[PDB]
Amino acid sequence: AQKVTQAQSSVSMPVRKAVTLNCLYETSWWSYYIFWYKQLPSKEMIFLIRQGSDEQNAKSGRYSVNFKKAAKSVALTISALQLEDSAKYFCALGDTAGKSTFGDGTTLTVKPNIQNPDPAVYQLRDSKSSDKSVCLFTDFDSQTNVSQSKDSDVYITDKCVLDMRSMDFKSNSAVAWSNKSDFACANAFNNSIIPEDTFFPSP
Amino acid sequence: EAQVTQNPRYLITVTGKKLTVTCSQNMNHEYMSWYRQDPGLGLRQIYYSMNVEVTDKGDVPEGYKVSRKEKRNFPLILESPSPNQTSLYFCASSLVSTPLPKETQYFGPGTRLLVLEDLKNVFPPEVAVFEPSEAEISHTQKATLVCLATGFYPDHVELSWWVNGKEVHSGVCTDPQPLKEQPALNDSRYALSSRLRVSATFWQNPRNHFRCQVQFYGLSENDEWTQDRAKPVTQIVSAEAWGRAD
């Protein structure tokens, strides 16, 4: 048939390392092309490299292609991963007249190396109001995994990598808030595994 | 300067109301293509044009019509928009139908199209700014501000931070996708958060001004509105906060 298959729905890898993304396809076409795209979180689509079915392994910048024509596998390799490389990557197959067939993509999360972790949960009051507060988990290691809230009246976002460029300081953070009565920051992330030395301010 | 432009970038429409999506390029590209990306999936090809007045059906042409009256334009026409045509639409263009190694095929920014039975569930966002805690300032000598946009529908929003009138990206992190407030309803409103972190001493300067801005994409003046509440037009809604001496 006409199918392109990207087995890895999601992959995590540390910064500056290399990653290999597999792409298999079945096709009755014997002259064709392979495209690789990078979709940013903004959903902006970006062309990276194209591999011709009659050419040797394409290479450009930090990207490299491993074309194994017999197995119909055309893996793209990214070296020296940067935080900007965290995105969803797509493998695409095209013919000799503009037609194309897309796989369903692969989400890459590049984990940064936190050199001085300091996990803490802080409470922040509204600039304008009262009662309306938010709890902030931040400065934890990228191997710590924040857990989806299991209480539908408490909202908790996934991890978030910010980059204070002026200080060469990267830190993770997550936000939790709720309208319920006696919602407290100490209770917000009980559904997640937080470090045992997680700072909870006493005053 | 090379760029692919789509209009509109965000579109809310009522079922069965005819609409056309424009795609244009000033690079005299021969080959242009339309795709739809459903969430979590890949791009499904709708129509492509190998040159002016050449049209061929892609994998999902049903319910769509195109024309290629010239090289510059390749509009996507939805004769009778239906709910299953709600998707993120990408228009692509390339120098030639079979690109050489050095040549790039350029993609537009995407068109977020939403087809609905009615627009009564459209709501603009409420936005608030949350000041950093004195404990973070004490513990880390840093200060994280949090912005919260709530009560909006759909998730056709863009959030940015502006410090002393200038947009900043260093120290910023925004959630990748907005989360549902009441996931059970398809018509659940959404919420979105983002963090901005600055040095502790920067927050303590009262001359520094912080603004979180949420661009909401909604109805147009052309769109009819019958409900009592304010018409949810395209608009900006912001919240502000000033630095505070210790």
Residue numbers in the entry:
A (entry chain D): 1 to 203
B (entry chain E): 1 to 246
Extract from the study:
TCR N17.1.2 was isolated by screening TILs from patients with melanoma for reactivity toward the mutated NRASQ61K neoantigen. Here, we report crystal structures of a TCR (N17.1.2) from a patient with melanoma that recognizes both NRASQ61K and NRASQ61R neoepitopes in complex with NRASQ61K–HLA-A*01 and NRASQ61R–HLA-A*01 as well as the structure of the unbound TCR. The TCRs are restricted by the prevalent major histocompatibility complex (MHC) class I allele HLA-A*01:01 (15).
Structural differences are limited to small side-chain movements. Overall, the CDR loops of unbound N17.1.2 have a backbone RMSD of 0.53 Å and an all-atom RMSD of 0.62 Å compared with the TCR bound to NRASQ61K–HLA-A1 (0.50 and 0.61 Å, respectively, compared with the TCR bound to NRASQ61R–HLA-A1). Hence, N17.1.2 behaves essentially as a rigid body in binding pMHC. We observed relatively limited conformational changes in TCR N17.1.2 and its CDR loops associated with binding, which would result in it being an easier target for traditional modeling approaches [e.g., TCRFlexDock (44)]; however, previous benchmarking has shown that AlphaFold’s complex modeling performance is not affected by the degree of binding conformational changes.
